[PDB]
Design a protein around this ligand. Structure first.
Ligand SMILES: CC[C@@H]1C[C@]1(NC(=O)[C@@H]1C[C@@H]2CN1C(=O)[C@H](C(C)(C)C)NC(=O)OCC(C)(C)CCCCc1cccc3c1CN(C3)C(=O)O2)C(=O)NS(=O)(=O)C1CC1
Ligand SMILES: [Zn+2]
Length: 199
């Protein structure tokens, strides 16, 4: 009831990226934890952004965000309704859809966007926050099976990351693991068409 002392949640902050530009996929950190906490509070992030897949953090969570069609997309269960930190201060979401577990902000200057897939191919590749590239066979509109199942620990923190087709187009945004006894045999994702509809 004490309005004057009510806090505000911080912004989502870009803290690194998954580098896919060369022959080797690898994670790069661009901001440490202390800088992250400060930048989340101010919403002012002057660091250079590059690439398609960003590693992002709040005060309490870390996950991924993926640029497609000039929008940096991620999961609502990570970002909520938060702004994203940017060189000019906090930027408000331009898309929010709790029903799809989806949010988006205008893509940061310097980022590159993936192109939505129109191949209609079911051989996919999930990119994790550790830059693992995991083959996934598409099994429905929003499901795919891991060719090599993994403990959910290996996938944790990768929601918001991409599933890509063989040509490197965006097919979906990783949302949940389909897990039994802690082993992810499959994943659920927001299909890129659903992004395109939300747009
Ligand atoms: C561990 C790697 C996982 C990718 C990951 N995501 C998760 O942990 C999400 C968050 C939460 C639970 N969950 C699951 O994956 C659970 C699980 C394994 C934890 C047991 N699976 C499940 O319920 O399958 C059941 C299934 C039927 C497939 C759900 C479909 C419904 C899909 C759905 C539709 C509409 C709205 C909402 C949902 C799900 N939703 C809101 C929501 O909040 O989901 C993550 O890494 N998160 S993270 O660590 O990066 C986090 C910091 C951001
Ligand atoms: Zn494609």
């Amino acid at each position: 009831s004490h309005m004057a002392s009510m806090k505000k949640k911080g912004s989502v902050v870009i803290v690194g990226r998954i580098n896919l530009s060369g022959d080797t996929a690898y994670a790069q950190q661009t901001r440490g934890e202390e800088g992250c906490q400060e930048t989340s509070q101010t919403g002012r992030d002057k660091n250079q952004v590059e690439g398609e897949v960003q590693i992002v953090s709040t005060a309490t969570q870390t996950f991924l965000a993926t640029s497609i069609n000039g929008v940096l997309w991620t999961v609502y269960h990570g970002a909520g309704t938060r702004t994203i930190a940017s060189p000019k201060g906090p930027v408000t979401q331009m898309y929010t859809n709790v029903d799809k577990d989806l949010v988006g902000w205008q893509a940061p200057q310097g980022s590159r966007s993936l192109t939505p897939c129109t191949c209609g191919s079911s051989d996919l590749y999930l990119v994790t926050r550790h830059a693992d590239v995991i083959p996934v066979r598409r099994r429905g509109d929003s499901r795919g099976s891991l060719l090599s199942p993994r403990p959910i620990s290996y996938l944790k923190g990768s929601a918001g990351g991409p599933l890509l087709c063989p040509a490197g187009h965006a097919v979906g945004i990783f949302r949940t693991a389909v897990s039994t006894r802690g082993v992810a045999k499959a994943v659920d994702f927001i299909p890129v068409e659903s992004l395109e509809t939300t747009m």
